[PDB]
Symmetry: none
Subunit: 22 residues, 18 copies
């Protein structure tokens, strides 16, 4: 499951960068 976890963290991290997370 590590691949899936990393993939999900990466998309969530990119979503947060595009939408702004601060």
């Amino acid at each position: 499951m590590e691949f899936v976890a990393k993939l999900f963290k990466f998309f969530k991290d990119l979503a947060g960068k595009f939408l702004g997370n601060n």
Copy 2:
């Protein structure tokens, strides 16, 4: 999994540079 982790860090790092991270 190290290759995937490095690839994801690299794209997130480049996204942060393009969008500005400070």
Copy 3:
């Protein structure tokens, strides 16, 4: 993995030079 790490550091370093990192 050292080749990949070096390649990623090099592109990030060049991106930072082109965009300005200070």
Copy 4:
């Protein structure tokens, strides 16, 4: 890996000279 490291340092050093690094 020394050849790759030297090659990357050399391109980064030349980029810094062309863009100005001080």
Copy 5:
């Protein structure tokens, strides 16, 4: 690797002379 190192130092030294390094 000494030949490569010397070659890179020589091009960087000449770049610095042409662009001015002081």
Copy 6:
């Protein structure tokens, strides 16, 4: 490598004379 080193020093020395090194 001494021949290469001498050749590089000689071209750098001549470049410095032509561009002025003082």
Copy 7:
């Protein structure tokens, strides 16, 4: 290597005489 060294010193010495070295 002595021949090469002498040849390089001689051309540098003549360059310095033609350009002026004082």
Copy 8:
């Protein structure tokens, strides 16, 4: 190498006489 050294000293000495060395 003595012949080469003498030949180089002689041309440098004559260059200095023609250009003036004092």
Copy 9:
């Protein structure tokens, strides 16, 4: 090498006489 040395001294001595050496 004595012949070469004498020949070079003689031409330098004559050059100095023609150009003036005092």
Copy 10:
């Protein structure tokens, strides 16, 4: 919905590769 569709196709494609699909 394209992101979800692509994500589902990708996991199904990887499942098929791991389990064998021919």
Copy 11:
């Protein structure tokens, strides 16, 4: 969506290379 599509094709292509696709 092109980035996601390319990323998914790349992981599927690498999975196929590691597992063998012929």
Copy 12:
């Protein structure tokens, strides 16, 4: 997207060389 495409082609090309692609 050209940078990403080139990066993915390059890693796939290197994977194919290491694993053998003929």
Copy 13:
């Protein structure tokens, strides 16, 4: 993108020379 393309071709060309490409 020409610099990146050239860099990737050069590493792939060197990989092919080291691993043998005929």
Copy 14:
């Protein structure tokens, strides 16, 4: 880009000479 292209051709040419290219 001509400097980079020439540098890459030169290293590939030297690699081919050292490894043998016929």
Copy 15:
């Protein structure tokens, strides 16, 4: 770029002489 081209041809020519090119 002529200086670089000449320098590279000269090192490749000398490498070929040392390794034998016929």
Copy 16:
């Protein structure tokens, strides 16, 4: 560039004489 070309031809010519070129 004529000085550099002549210098390179001269070293290559001398290398060929020392190693034998027929």
Copy 17:
């Protein structure tokens, strides 16, 4: 450049006499 050309021809001619050129 005539002085340099003559000097190089003279050293090559003497090298050929010492090593034998027929």
Copy 18:
């Protein structure tokens, strides 16, 4: 340049006499 040419011809002529030129 006539002096230099004559000097070089004279040394080459004497070298040929000492080493034998027929």
